[PDB]
Amino acid sequence: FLGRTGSSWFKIFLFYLIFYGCLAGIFIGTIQVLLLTLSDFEPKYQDRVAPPGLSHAPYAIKTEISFSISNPKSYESFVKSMHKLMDLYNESSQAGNSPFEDCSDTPADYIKRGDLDDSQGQKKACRFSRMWLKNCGYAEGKPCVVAKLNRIIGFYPKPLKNTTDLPEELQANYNQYVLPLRCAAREKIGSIEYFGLGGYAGFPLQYYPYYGKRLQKKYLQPLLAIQFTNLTQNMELRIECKVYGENIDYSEKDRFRGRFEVKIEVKS
Amino acid sequence: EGPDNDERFTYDYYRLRVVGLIVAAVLCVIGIIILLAGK
Amino acid sequence: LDELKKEVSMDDHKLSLDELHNKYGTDLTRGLTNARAKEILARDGPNSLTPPPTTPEWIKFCRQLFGGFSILLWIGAILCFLAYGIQAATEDEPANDNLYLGVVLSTVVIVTGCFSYYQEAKSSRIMDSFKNMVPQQALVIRDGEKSTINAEFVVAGDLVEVKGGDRIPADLRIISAHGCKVDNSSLTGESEPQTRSPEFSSENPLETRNIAFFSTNCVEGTARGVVVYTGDRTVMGRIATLASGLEVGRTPIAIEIEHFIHIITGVAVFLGVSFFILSLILGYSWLEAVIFLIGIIVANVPEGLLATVTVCLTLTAKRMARKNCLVKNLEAVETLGSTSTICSDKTGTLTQNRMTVAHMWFDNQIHEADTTENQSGAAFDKTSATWSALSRIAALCNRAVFQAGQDNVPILKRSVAGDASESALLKCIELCCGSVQGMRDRNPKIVEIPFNSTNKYQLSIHENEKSSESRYLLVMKGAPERILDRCSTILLNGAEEPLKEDMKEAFQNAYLELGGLGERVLGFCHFALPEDKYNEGYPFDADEPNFPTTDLCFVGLMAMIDPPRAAVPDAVGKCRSAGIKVIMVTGDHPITAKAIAKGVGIISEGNETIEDIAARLNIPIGQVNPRDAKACVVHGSDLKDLSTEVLDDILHYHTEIVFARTSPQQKLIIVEGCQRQGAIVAVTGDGVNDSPALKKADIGVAMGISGSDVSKQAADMILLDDNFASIVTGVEEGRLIFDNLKKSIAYTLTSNIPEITPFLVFIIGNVPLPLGTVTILCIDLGTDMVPAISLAYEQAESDIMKRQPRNPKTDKLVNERLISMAYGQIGMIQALGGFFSYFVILAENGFLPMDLIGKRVRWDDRWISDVEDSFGQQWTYEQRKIVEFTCHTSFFISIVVVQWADLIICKTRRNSIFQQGMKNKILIFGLFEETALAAFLSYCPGTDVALRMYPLKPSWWFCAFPYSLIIFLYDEMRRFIIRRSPGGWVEQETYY
Ligand SMILES: *[C@@H]1O[C@H](CO)[C@@H](O[C@@H]2O[C@H](CO)[C@@H](O)[C@H](O)[C@H]2NC(C)=O)[C@H](O)[C@H]1NC(C)=O
Ligand SMILES: CC(C)CCC[C@@H](C)[C@H]1CC[C@H]2[C@@H]3CC=C4C[C@@H](O)CC[C@]4(C)[C@H]3CC[C@]12C
Ligand SMILES: *[C@@H]1O[C@H](CO)[C@@H](O)[C@H](O)[C@H]1NC(C)=O
Ligand SMILES: [K+]
Ligand SMILES: [K+]
Ligand SMILES: [K+]
Ligand SMILES: [Mg+2]
C-alpha cells in the first residue's frame, strides 16, 4: 500500500487496538484510585479558594456596566443576568420544612449542623427572602447592583473587631454578627444605599458554614443589594465595593478577591 | 477546630519554596560531582 | 564547465627549439622585446590565478533561516503578531502574551540559524594555496639582457632562466640546461629529483625532460626555457581551477537531516491544518483559531533538536581532536562511518615517504631490515663478520650527512643532505652500528670516485682503522650486475672464497627476488689492497684508474624502498573487515605501486591480475579470462584512453584495484567513478596532486605532518600526527554517532506527543487547557536539552566494526520504526501520565474529572468570577487560573518524570540496561540537572509571573511515576523480544 502488505497492515492494527486498549484501561485504573482517595463532601485542598471572592449580578462587559436611561434595549442585557440570580431566590422554591428553615430576621450567629457526614440527611439551610432586598424590571436609571460572597465549605466569615479605627467608623456596627460591605471611589460623586438582611449593609453570619453541594443542595447564600442613586451622569465612575473581615484579604492581581471593580456610566 | 478552623484554608507555600530550592541546589551540586569524576 | 579540465593535456615539447620560437614570436638568445612582452601581456592576461566566485556569508546564514522547522516557527511567530494585532485593534488587551511569544519564537529561529550555520561550514582556500606556488618574481631575458620582473608580467614566449632553489614561474620548454634537476612531486606526488634537458624524451609531455611546470621547483643546476603557458592555462593552473571549482555538494548526514525535517514538517502541517478546520467546524472564532494553531506549531516542531545534533557532532569532534585528528567541517565526523570505499594515495599516505633499507643479501642469505618509523620489528643479524664488512662499505662509500642539530629527533625522522639512497644507507647503519660519523673518522677517506652516469659505481679509498694494518682499503657500490663483473671472491661468513657459477646464480636469484619486491637494489664490494704494492705515502689518482678496479671481493647486496607506515597494513585490514573497499590511486610507477599494495593488504595473498595469470601459465594476455582476475593494476596511460563506462566496469569487476601513474584529474575520475556506483567515498592523501580527488570525496582526509598546504586545504579532516590508524577510529566514531543520533532524536521526539495531545483534547473535550505554549519551550529548550545531548556519549551495543557500511538509500537516520516508537508508543504513555497529573490537581482542588467536560466556555470567561466546582464552591477568575497554571506546571514536571525512563530506554536500541549498564556519567548529569531545572522553575519566586510556573506540592511530583515505570518495563520487555528472536516482527516494526 503506502507502507506494507495486507497481512502486515492487519498485525499493526491488531497491535495498536490491544495496546491502546490496555493503555486506556490503565489510565482509567489510575483515575479510579485517585477518586477513591477523595471525599464526597469536601475537597482535599481549599487554600486556592482561601480568601473568598466577591461577585455581582450585573454581567460586566469588562468589569463595566455602561448604558442609557433614554434607551429601552440599553439595559435589557444587564437585567437578564440580574433576573437570572434573583429568579433563584423565589419563595415558591423555598417550600415546606424540608429542606428549608426560617432563621432570625435580624443577623445572628453561626449554625453548626454537625460534621461533614452523611450521618444525617440533607442539612437544613436558612431561607432568604428577596423582599429583604429593598427597592430591587430593575433600576432603569441609577442601577441596583446585587453582591454575593463566594461559597466555601466549612468557612466561617469573621468580621473585624471594633478595637481600633475602622473605615465606616463604628456606624451601625453589629460587631458580633455582620460581615460588612462598603462601596467607594476623593472622586465622591455618588449616593451609597445598602439593602440586606435586617436592613444591614452586610452578610448575616447565620448562613454559615456552607456544607457543600452534596450535603446542602438548594442552600441559599445571603445577598446584598447596592443602589447608586448618584446625582451625576455621562461619565465613567470607578467604584470599588469592599468586604471587611478577619478571614478576608485582597490581591493586586486578583481584583475580585473580596472586592468589586464596577465602571458605571449612565450615558443618557 | 469549630469556628476557628482557619488552618484548613492555609498552605505554607513559603517553606515549600525554600525546601524546593534547597533540593534543586543539592541535585545540581550532586550532578556536578558525578560529571566531574574525570571531566 | 570543468569537464574540459578533467582531461589530460596536449603539448609542444615535440617541436624543435627553432619551431617553438616561430609559434610564440620569440628569440632563443635575445628574448622578447620590452614592447612585444607588454603587448602579449595585454593580449593573454596576467601570469596569475583568479579565485572562484564565492557565496558571501550573508546568504549562507539566511538560507538556514528558511529550512522546514524555521518556516513553521516563522508562521508561528508571525501568527502570534497577527493575533496580537487583532487584539490591539479590537478589545484593548493589557497583556504581553502574543507579543512576547512572537519575540521569543523569532529568537529561537535566529539562534537555531547559528547552530545549523556552524554545522554547514566550508573552510575552502584551495586557490590561495596554489597562488603561493607562483614566485613573487621571475628572471627573464628581454632585449638580450637578464632582469628580474614581477612574475605576473611573465607572458607566453619570453626567455626564462631558473636555478637550484627557485620555483618554476610558468610552464616552460627547456631550450638549454646544465645539470638541472627538478621536483615534480606536485604532478606525481613523488619528490625524487627529475632531470631536465632540451631533448624530447617521451611522447608524454608529463614525462618528457624538455618541459618544466609551474607549481614545481628547480632543485639543482640551471636551465633556460620558453614560456608555453601562463596563469590559468598552465598544467597545474588547470588543476587549481578544477580543485577550487568543483561543486562541494551535500554530505550523507546533511541529506539525513533534511529527510526527517520533511517527515516532521509533514506531520506538522497535516495536524496543523487538520485541526484548524476541525476547530472552525466546531465553531471557533478566527481570533482563537490562530492561538490553537500557534500551539500546534510549537507542539509539533522539536525546537531544540537541530541544536542537539550540532552539539552531539561537536562533542564527537572534540574526542577526535584529542586523538590528533582535526575535523574542519562538523558533518565530516559522520561521513567516515558511512564510507564504503577509500581511495588512498600511496607516497606519504600509506608510506613514510623515505627510502629505507628493506633487505640485505649476504652469506648466500636474504635478511630483512625493519622498515617501520618507531622500529617495531626485530633484529636480523649482528653476529656475522660479513655484516660488519658490508656495514663498513655502506657507511664509508657514502657521501650523505645528517643536518646540524638533529641529535634530539630519532634517526629515521631526521633530515639528511644527500640523495635518497645514500640517506637510506646512512640511517640503516647509524641505527644498528651507532655513529656513522664515528666510522668515517676511524677510516679517513683519502681519494674517491663519485657515482658516474658512465661508471655506474662509486668508489672510495680509506685508511684502515686497524693498528696492525693502518693500510689502504678500497670500497665501492653501484649496479648489482656491474659490481659482480668486478669481483673474483665472495666474503662468506668471514673468509673470502672464489666466485663459483653456483654462487653467481644464487646472487641472480637474490637479485631477481629483491627486484621483484619493487625494491631498488645495490651491489657492495671491497678490496684490501696489497701492502707491498701500496706505501703509507702512496698517491692515488681518481682521474685515471691508478689502482685495480677488477678482481675485488663481493660482500653483499642491499635493497631499499619507500616503506609502509607501521600502522598502515593493520589499518587496511581493519577497514576491509568493516566491509570498506580500499583502492590505491597513485602517481607512482606500477611496479612500486603493486609491491606496496601487497605489503599493506590492498592486494591480498594469492590474488592475481590478468598479467600474473598470463606469466604463470606462459600464455598471451588475450588468452586469459579477465573474470579469473580479481586484482587489477591500471596504468594512467591506459586509463587515459578508457571511457567512464569502461572504468565503471573495472570498478565493478575487481575487488583489489591499483590505479598507478595517475594524473590529478585521473584521481578525481576514479573518485567520481566510485561515486557514480552509489558509494560514499573517502580520499586519503598528502600531495597537491590529491587536491581534486580530496575535494570531490565525500570526505577528504589529509596527512598533517607530511601533507602539502594544498592537500590540507582540500580535506575535511587532518591527521595531525600522520597516524593512519585514525581512519579506523574515525569510521568507528562515525558509526557510533549515527546510532547515538537516532537515540537522541527518538528521545527528543517522544516528548512531542505529550505536548500535542493536550491541545487536541482542549478542542475535542472543551476542558481547561492542560499545558501552555510557554511550558512547551521550557521542555524543548530547557529540560530535554542536556539529556538529549548526553546520548552522544553512549558506547556501542555490539562490535560496530563487524557490520557492513550502511546503505544510504535504505538505512535512514529517521525512519517509520522510530516514528512508530516515539509517537505511537512511548510518547502516548507520556501523554497519559501528563493528563493524569492534570486530573489529580483539579480533582484535589474540587473540580472532579466528570464536571470538566465542556467547562472551558465558563472557565476562560474573564467576567464570571463565581465558577461552581463539583463541591458547590465558587471561584474567581484568577483563583481558578492559578490552579490551571499549577496544572501546567505539574504537566510539565510529569514530562520530566517520564523523560527519566525515556532517557534510560533510549540509551539502548537492542541491549538491556542491565547489559549496557549506567556508565554514561553525562547522562546521569542530565537526569540530576534536568530535575534541578524543573524544581528551580517551579519553586523560584517570580517564575509564576515570567513563565507561569507555580509551586508544586510534594505529592504532585509522584503522579506520573507509575507511567514512568511502565515505559521502562514496556520497553525492556519489547527489547527482550528483539534479542530473543532476531527473526523480525518486533525488529522490523520497532528497531530504530
Ligand atoms: C421567580 O420569581 C419571579 C418574580 O418576578 C417570577 O416571575 C413571574 O413570572 C410570571 C410569568 O412571566 C409573571 O406573570 C409574574 O408577574 C412574575 N412574578 C411573580 C411574583 O409571580 C419567576 O417566574 C420565578 N421563577 C421560578 C422558576 O420560580
Ligand atoms: C490523540 C490520539 C487519539 C491520536 C493517536 C494517533 C495515532 C492514530 C498515530 C500516531 C503515530 C501513528 C503511527 C506511526 C508509525 C507508523 C508507521 C508507518 O509506516 C505506518 C503507520 C504507523 C503504524 C502509524 C499509525 C497511526 C499512529 C499510531
Ligand atoms: C424605594 O421604593 C420605596 C417605595 O417602595 C420608596 O419609599 C423609596 O423612595 C425608594 N427609594 C429610593 C432610593 O428611590
Ligand atoms: K515540541
Ligand atoms: K571533500
Ligand atoms: K520534544
Ligand atoms: Mg603523496
Is residue B16 included in any domain, yes or no?
yes
All cell numbers assigned to C376? 617495531
C-alpha C247/C-alpha C256 separation (Å) is 20
Q: Which of B24, B35, B38 sits opposite C935 (nearest CB)?
A: B24
Question: What does the alpha-carbon distance between residue C68 and residue C76 come to, in Å, rounded to a whole number?
Answer: 12
Classified as helix, coil or strand, C786 is helix
C-alpha dihedral (C917, C923, C928, C932), degrees to nearest 10: -160
Same domain? C783 vs C860: yes
To test the pocket of ligand 1, the residue of A90, A136, A138, A220 to mutate (highest count of ligand atoms within 8 Å of its CB) is A90
> Comparing C-alpha atoms, which of A264, A194, A37, A219 is closest to residue C874?
A219
Q: In this structure, is residue B25 part of a structural domain?
A: yes
All structural domains of chain A, each given as residue ranges with its CATH number in brackets, are 1-38 (1.20.5.170), 39-268 (2.60.40.1660)
Q: What radius of gyration do chain A's Cα atoms show?
A: 25
The β-bridge relationship of strands A178-184 and A202-204 is antiparallel
Q: Which domain holds residue B22?
A: 11-35
Is the same domain home to C871 and C732? Answer: yes
CATH number, domain at C410? 3.40.1110.10
C-alpha cell of residue A66 = 455602561
Helix (H, G, I), strand (E, B) or coil at C288: helix
| Cβ neighbours of C961 in A, within 8 Å | none
Name the residue with cell 591499483: C658
Q: Is the CB of A87 within 6 Å of ligand 1?
A: yes
d(CA C378, CA C369): 8
Give yes or no: residues C907 and C813 share one domain.
yes
Cell readout for C841 is: 490537581
The answer to the question of residue C344 being in a domain is yes
Subunit contact C939:B35, Cβ cutoff 8 A: no
3-state SS class at B22: helix
Domain boundary among C212, C245, C278: C245
Taking contacts as CB-CB distances below 8 angstroms, the residues of chain B near A156 are 3-5
Helix (H, G, I), strand (E, B) or coil at C381: coil
Domain finish residue from C724, C754, C786: C724
* Residues A59, A56: Cα–Cα separation, whole Å: 8
**CATH (domain of C186):** 2.70.150.10
Enter the C-alpha cell of residue C535.
706505501
C848 plus C774 within the same structural domain = yes
Q: Specify if B21 maps to a domain.
A: yes
φ, ψ for residue C138 (rounded to 5)?
Answer: -130, 155
Q: Is residue B26 part of a domain?
A: yes
- Residue C56 domain-assigned? no
Secondary structure element (H or E) that encloses residue A240, with its range: strand A237-243
Backbone angles phi, psi at C897, to 5 degrees: -65, -40
Torsion sign across C-alpha atoms C918, C923, C929, C935: negative
* CA atoms of A12 and C825, how far apart (whole Å): 12
DSSP conformation class of A205: G
Q: Is the dihedral of CA C594, C600, C606, C607 positive or negative?
A: negative
Structure's resolution in angstroms: 2.8
Same domain, C712 and C571: yes
Let me know if residue C121 belongs to a domain.
no
Can you tell me the distance from the alpha carbon of C828 to that of A23, in angstroms, rounded to the nearest whole number? 9
Identify the sign of the CA torsion C664, C669, C670, C672: positive
Assign A63 to helix, strand or coil. coil
Q: Residue A135 Cα, ligand 3 centroid: separation in angstroms?
A: 6
Which residues are registered as beta bridge partners of C911?
none
Q: Are C677 and C781 within one domain?
A: no
CB C203 within 8 A of CB C12: no
Phi, psi (5° rounding) for residue C195? -60, 145
- Tell me the residue range of the domain where C429 lies: 353-563
Total tally of structural domains belonging to chain B: 1
* Whether C251 and C195 share a structural domain: no
Cell 497577527 identifies what position?
C82
CA distance A107 to A109: 7
Q: Is residue B5 part of a domain?
A: no
Chosen domain end from C724, C758, C784: C724
What is the C-alpha to C-alpha distance for residues C867 and C873, in angstroms, rounded to an integer?
8
**Ligand nearest to the Cα of C763, by number:** 2
Q: CA–CA separation, C21 vs C10, rounded Å? A: 18
- Say whether B9 and A50 touch across the interface (CB within 8 A): yes
Residues C107 and C21 occupy one common structural domain: no
Q: Identify the nearest ligand to the CA of C72 by its number.
A: 4
In a domain, B1, yes or no: no
> What backbone torsions phi and psi does residue C861 show, to the nearest 5 degrees?
-60, 110
CA–CA gap between residue C461 and residue C470 (Å, rounded): 12
Residue C36 and residue C31: Cα distance in Å, rounded? 10
Counting other chains too, the contacts that C537-542 makes at CB distance below 8 Å and 24 or more residues apart are C538/C472, C540/C446, C540/C447, C540/C461, C540/C472, C541/C447, C542/C447, C542/C448, C542/C449
Q: Is residue B27 part of a domain?
A: yes
What is the number of CB-based contacts under 8 A between chain A and chain B? 22
Q: Is residue C51 part of a domain?
A: no
Q: Are residues C638 and C764 in the same domain?
A: no
CA distance A256 to C75: 37
Do C34 and C137 lie in a common domain?
A: yes
Q: Residue C635 forms beta bridges with which residues?
A: C660
In 3D space, the residue among C118, C49, C129, C115 whose CA is nearest the CA of residue C702 turns out to be C129
Q: How many angstroms does the Cα of residue C783 sit away from the middle of ligand 1?
A: 60
| Best of C931, C943, C952 to mutate (most B CBs within 10 Å, chain B) | C931
Chain C residues 935-974 with a CB less than 8 Å from chain B: 935-936, 938-941, 951-954
Q: Is residue C365 part of a domain?
A: yes
Same domain (yes/no): C231, C96: no
Please answer whether residues C889 and B16 qualify as being in contact, where contact means their C-beta atoms are separated by less than 8 angstroms. Answer: no
- The residue count for chain A: 268
Residue C54, domain member (yes or no): no
- State residue C808 phi and psi, 5-degree precision: -65, -20
> Is the Cβ–Cβ distance between C789 and C315 less than 8 Å?
yes
CB atoms within 10 A of CB C373: 17
Contact C753, C267 (CB under 8 A): no
Determination technique for this entry: X-ray
Q: How many domains does chain C contain in total?
A: 4
Contact criterion met (CB < 8 Å) for A46 and B8: yes
C739 & C881 share domain: yes
Residue C768 domain-assigned (yes or no): yes
8 Å CB contact between A247 and A156: yes
CATH of residue C674:
3.40.50.1000
**B3 in any annotated domain:** no
User: Which cell numbers hold the place of C383?
Assistant: 653476529
Strand partners, C520: C560
What's the A88 CA to ligand 1 centre distance in angstroms?
A: 10
Q: How many contacts (CB atoms, under 8 Å) link B and C?
A: 53
Residue C200 belongs to some domain of the structure: yes
Measured in whole angstroms, the distance separating CA C124 from the mean position of its chain's CA atoms is 14
